[PDB]
Amino acid sequence: ENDLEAIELARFAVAEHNSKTNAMLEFERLVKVRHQVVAGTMHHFTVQVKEAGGGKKLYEAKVWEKVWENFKQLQSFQPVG
Amino acid sequence: HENDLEAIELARFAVAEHNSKTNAMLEFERLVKVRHQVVAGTMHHFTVQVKEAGGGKKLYEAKVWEKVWENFKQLQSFQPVG
Ligand code: NA
């Protein structure tokens, strides 16, 4: 593939896999490559909300937000208690 | 800090999203604790040919997570493909 950078990472994946599983696999060649840039901030929020009707409660929220791209996403939202 | 408006607006987003998805009927009151985790890296997807022993050949899809501003890489998954 002439792509020595990606091959080195492929060999590492094989080595790591063998290390975990004793699969005894031998790297032969890299047939497909894809590089996914991930750049963002994982926000952890503790939030107080007013429930219906009246009671106040605390929730833990987790929000994923990208920096170079217009994208935010609620990962999880569960009661603290 | 939980007093930065930028953070509060995101907390508002969280509450609104939860209401939209689950009909939770919650009203944002305040943001009491904030934590920012920077994430910067590359998720590599590789289809790799290996030799067993076996000793036949087989294809695997590997995922490797790698941070760019830190010296860290990690095997995420290693699955056999048909
Ligand atoms: Na969503």
Q: How many helices (H) and strands (E) does chain A have?
A: 1, 3
- Look at residue A32 and give its three-state secondary structure: strand
β-bridge mates for residue A38, sequence order: B41
C-alpha–C-alpha distance, residues B51 and A51, integer Å: 59
Span from the CA of B80 to the centroid of ligand 1 (angstroms): 29
Between the alpha carbon of residue A27 and those of residues B17, B53, B76, the distances in Å are 45, 12, 18
Looking at beta carbons, which residues of chain B come within 8 Å of A34? 44-46
Which residue of A lies nearest to B79 if distances are taken between CA atoms? A17
**Domain interval for residue A27:** 1-81
Determine if the peptide bond prior to B55 is cis (ω within 30°).
yes
Please name the method used to determine this structure. Answer: X-ray
C-alpha–C-alpha distance, residues B75 and B79, integer Å: 11
Q: What are phi and psi of A5, to 5 degrees?
A: -70, -45
Alpha helices in chain A (DSSP H): 4-21
Q: Do A43 and B17 touch (CB under 8 A)?
A: no
Number of domains in chain B: 1
DSSP B36-49: EEEEEEEEEEEEEE
Q: Do B32 and A42 touch (CB under 8 A)?
A: no
Q: Do A41 and B36 touch (CB under 8 A)?
A: yes
Q: Residue A77 sits in a domain of what CATH number?
A: 3.10.450.10
Q: Do B10 and A43 touch (CB under 8 A)?
A: yes
Distance of residue A56 Cα from the nearest chain B Cα, in angstroms: 8
From the list A3, A6, A10, the residue with the least C-alpha distance to A28 is: A10
- To which residue do tokens 């997570």 refer? B65
From the list A52, A67, A79, A76, the residue with the least C-alpha distance to B14 is: A76
Q: Which residues of B51-82 are buried (b: 16+ CB within 10 A; e: fewer)?
A: eeeeeeeeebebbbbbeeeeeebebeebeeee
C-alpha–C-alpha distance, residues B35 and B17, integer Å: 19
B7, B15, B44: residue with CB nearest A35: B44
